[PDB]
Ligand SMILES: Nc1nc2c(ncn2[C@@H]2O[C@H](COP(=O)(O)OP(=O)(O)O)[C@@H](O)[C@H]2O)c(=O)[nH]1
């Protein structure tokens with residue numbers, strides 16, 4: 324079970340819309356998905372299991388600093404079948420990677436939607452996102468399918484064992 | 489003002505994506521918005537306040553049958569500024585109104601996003617959503633802006649007394 328795995332105050336899971344973040348959240352089975360509107364046009368989905376807070380919002384296109392406080396892990400979910408917006412995904416990851424309040428957080432990239440036939444594999448996304456130029460920060464890419472749960476654990480197993488080194 | 493209204497079962501708030509339904513749910517302030525995924529591709533936002541259940545999903549499955557059994561009012565949210573998709577919203581409301589398990593549920597229409605300059609007012613939304621063709625059912629349209637809550641009270645007050 325996934326509750327025993329995380330046996331990190333905030334895990335920020337972001338990415339473009341329709342990447343599957345809400346589905347991954349529901350697949351964790353760690354509590355209800357609560358959605359709040361802190362400010363207008365800013366939707367946030369949260370799952371508080373005990374002490375761990377999974378914060379989710381879509382990116383694309385300064386109150387985020389508050390969430391970046393005590394964010395020990397970043398999960399960047401990607402639609403591996405969305406070749407039209409993979410460049411936009413890299414630029415959004417590069418944006419948050421260059422946030423000084425977030426450089427301490429470990430990064431987990433999810434090459435989601437591997438079930439689709441023309442989806443890019445985990446290593447093509449590795450290159451498209453430019454992950455191999457990351458330095459002074461542990462990162463890990465995991466091939467996942469959120470609607471099934473494939474790879475969701477082994478990815479988050481790396482995350483939980485990475486924050487608690 | 490909102491929480492006072494529904495103090496005295498199932499309310500179905502449907503509409504196209506980006507219509508403002510999540511925004512309205514947060515304005516009710518009757519409880520936390522809970523997102524659930526009963527089946528793949530079906531996202532449902534729910535706000536429960538003791539007796540009442542505010543169910544929200546996007547339109548545009550035979551599973552809807554079982555949400556309908558005690559659905560007393562349906563709130564159809566439509567973005568008054570989205571002129572390209574207004575006909576699609578008309579089709580999805582017609583599919584909802586032809587449903588037999590919701591035949592006795594009153595209809596509240598919310599012409600949302602009136603704050604935008606090129607947004608269709610409640611008059612032509614009424615004309616193009618086809619509310620005057622509606623018989624066998626009391627319906628009501630209200631011009632709203634869920635961002636500021638403009639109009640939500642007057643529309644939910646009508647819903648309050650029809651199902652009060
Ligand atoms: N084929 C496939 N579809 C997925 C997967 N994960 C999510 N989806 C679909 O992507 C759509 C959007 O999912 P959602 O979790 O709401 O994306 P979000 O915007 O990041 O929250 C849904 O209709 C899901 O069915 C996956 O692993 N494979």
Ligand SMILES: Nc1nc2c(ncn2[C@@H]2O[C@H](COP(=O)(O)OP(=O)(O)O)[C@@H](O)[C@H]2O)c(=O)[nH]1
Pocket residue numbers: 363364365366503504505506507508509510511512546565600601602603604632633634635636
């Ligand atoms: N201008 C304006 N924007 C709105 C209004 N209501 C919602 N929005 C915007 O529409 C976007 C999506 O709204 P949402 O409630 O999530 O739509 P939903 O798909 O029905 O849940 C949000 O980013 C809001 O900023 C409104 O009355 N006026």
